[PDB]
Amino acid sequence: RIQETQAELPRGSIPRSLEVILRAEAVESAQAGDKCDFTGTLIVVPDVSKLSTPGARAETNSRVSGVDGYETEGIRGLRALGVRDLSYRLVFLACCVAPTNPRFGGKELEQTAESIKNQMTVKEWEKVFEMSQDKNLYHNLCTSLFPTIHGNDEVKRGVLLMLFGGVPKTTGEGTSLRGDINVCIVGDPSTAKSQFLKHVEE
Amino acid sequence: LVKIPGIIIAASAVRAKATRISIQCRSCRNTLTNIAMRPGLEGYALPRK
Ligand SMILES: Nc1ncnc2c1ncn2[C@@H]1O[C@H](COP(=O)(O)OP(=O)(O)O)[C@@H](O)[C@H]1O
Numbered sequence A: 001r002i003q004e005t006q007a008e009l010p011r012g013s014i015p016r017s018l019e020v021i022l023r024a025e026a027v028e029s030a031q032a033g034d035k036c037d038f039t040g041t042l043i044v045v046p047d048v049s050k051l052s053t054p055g056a057r058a059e060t061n062s063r064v065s066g067v068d069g070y071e072t073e074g075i076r077g078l079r080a081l082g083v084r085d086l087s088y089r090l091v092f093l094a095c096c097v098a099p100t101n102p103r104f105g106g107k108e109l110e111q112t113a114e115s116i117k118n119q120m121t122v123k124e125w126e127k128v129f130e131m132s133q134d135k136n137l138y139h140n141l142c143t144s145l146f147p148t149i150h151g152n153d154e155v156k157r158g159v160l161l162m163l164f165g166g167v168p169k170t171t172g173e174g175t176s177l178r179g180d181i182n183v184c185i186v187g188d189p190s191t192a193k194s195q196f197l198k199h200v201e202e
Numbered sequence B: 001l002v003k004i005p006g007i008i009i010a011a012s013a014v015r016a017k018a019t020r021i022s023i024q025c026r027s028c029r030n031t032l033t034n035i036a037m038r039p040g041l042e043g044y045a046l047p048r049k
């Protein structure tokens, strides 16, 4: 099940949801919460749902008429004439799924560092390597992540480190060591807490 | 529709063949009147319900 993206919504409306059918090799390609592009066809699927009223229906064109004792009326008459409701619903049948905004322009696919690097293009990894070698990268990331926020440098730095996170571990006894930091901003009104959260969300 | 000549060598007794029949249900006693019978040597199968 997918649903309408937020930028597509008209005024006063809830996002429409349609169910897309993925087949043989596209079959695991869209995960919950993923912004995806689906290429395929919009199809109708006969759905069994009525009592809005009797609606459109199909029946034989052959002019049969039940004899006395077998009058083609009621349920026997509907069964004899092959009467069925022509009720349908729209469904997308996707031949192909792609991320809407791809991360690396090269090629998606175990997610090791080399897999991510191979996933890139040449210019993309030029940039990645460049900024990895960037002295003063910490400040540059803080400034390029929160441009419109003045001051609050520590909050920028901490939110950045949250974005990068630590290393999860497992103890021999089975204890799991948390490897990603949590940050809480406490502040007076209008000090841009919601703005930090919106920056990170977007 | 054919037209043939001939000599008649036997004539059965005149009997009674129904043109319309009425049938009644054994339990609810409701009737299924004025069922039209086909003319000629043709029979009728009663409704089974
Ligand atoms: N350095 C800053 N300090 C305080 N407020 C700022 C700063 N920069 C921008 N603002 C503005 O203050 C407004 C209130 O921010 P908001 O996060 O909505 O309030 P709150 O912090 O109460 O949730 C925002 O529109 C934001 O743009």
Ligand SMILES: [Mg+2]
Residues within 6 Å of the ligand: A193, A194
């Ligand atoms: Mg707020």
Ligand SMILES: [Zn+2]
Residues within 6 Å of the ligand: B025, B026, B027, B028, B029, B030
């Ligand atoms: Zn009866």
